[PDB]
Amino acid sequence: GSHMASAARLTMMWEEVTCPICLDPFVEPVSIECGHSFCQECISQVGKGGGSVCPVCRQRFLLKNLRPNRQLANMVNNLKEISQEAREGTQGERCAVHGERLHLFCEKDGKALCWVCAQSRKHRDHAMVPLE
Amino acid sequence: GSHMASAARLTMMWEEVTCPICLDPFVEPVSIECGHSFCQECISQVGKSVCPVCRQRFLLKNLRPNRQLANMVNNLKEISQEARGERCAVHGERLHLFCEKDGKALCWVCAQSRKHRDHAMVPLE
Ligand SMILES: [Zn+2]
Ligand SMILES: [Zn+2]
Ligand SMILES: [Zn+2]
Ligand SMILES: [Zn+2]
Ligand SMILES: [Zn+2]
Ligand SMILES: [Zn+2]
Ligand SMILES: [Zn+2]
Ligand SMILES: [Zn+2]
């Protein structure tokens, strides 16, 4: 049957589908030699000229050995959907990256945030205020 | 905040972390060249060739760890634990069914999975 997924549990699941370079949910997730995964755009940037080292474990990698890791993108989609299936007859703007409702504004980044955004490493030290 | 994961949604997430070879949740998940992933054991034994899902060629030296998949398994098992009896070893959910073909005790995820859903099952007593 169904189960309640706590806030803490959802945070951990998001963590697993989050790029270590940009700290957003993975977009076109790919893995390098060592098996660590990244957004394809992100690791392509780090490896400009053909290669570099893994930002997590410092093992060497080549851009030609990029591998698609589609299950991670599927898992992002499953997590975004939990937010839309949520609403007990309810509808409004949703975070482009998490699919949760937007109720906060990051003054540093000058954009709206959901609660997942607010707690994440990417924003949790920024100044935030409620939307109005 | 919190959200209800429906049974349908849970099922879908389980499907993503299930090995196409043994039809259980990944144990030591690893990828081959096409990007398809498998338990290390399961794909190793296919080598001892061609991708069971899509048929693209692969080589065993090119296996890569895909640890996110294992971490997700662990996350999904905790969901059941945090809503809390005897528990499925692969899914963490409560056992209430018994498979007459395999002779083992099943959780609701087992029962609806490709692996046992065609098997004769009965309630535990
Ligand atoms: Zn990224
Ligand atoms: Zn690495
Ligand atoms: Zn967000
Ligand atoms: Zn911010
Ligand atoms: Zn397997
Ligand atoms: Zn394949
Ligand atoms: Zn089970
Ligand atoms: Zn069975």
Numbering used by the authors:
A (entry chain B): -2 to 129
B (entry chain A): -2 to 45, 49 to 84, 89 to 129
Paper quotes:
To understand how the B-Box modulates TRIM21 catalysis we solved a 2 Å crystal structure of the RING-Box protein. Comparison to the TRIM5α RING:E2 complex shows that the B-Box is located where helix 1 of the E2 would normally be positioned during RING binding. Crucially, the B-Box is able to occupy the E2 binding site on the RING by acting as an E2 mimic, forming similar electrostatic interactions. The {1H}15N NOE ratios reveal that the most dynamic region is the linker (residues 83–102) between the RING and B-Box. This is in agreement with the higher temperature factors observed for these residues in the crystal structure.
Recent work from our lab has shown that, in addition to classical FcR immunity mediated at the cell-surface, antibodies exert potent immune function from inside cells via a unique cytosolic IgG receptor called TRIM21. TRIM21 is a member of a large family of ~100 proteins with a common ‘tripartite motif’ architecture, comprising N-terminal RING, B-Box and coiled-coil domains. Instead of recruiting Src and Syk kinases, TRIM21 stimulates immune signaling via the activity of its RING domain, which catalyses the synthesis of polyubiquitin chains. Here we show that initiating ubiquitination is a key step in regulating TRIM21 activity and that a novel mechanism of autoinhibition and kinase-induced E2 enzyme recruitment controls its potent pro-inflammatory activity.
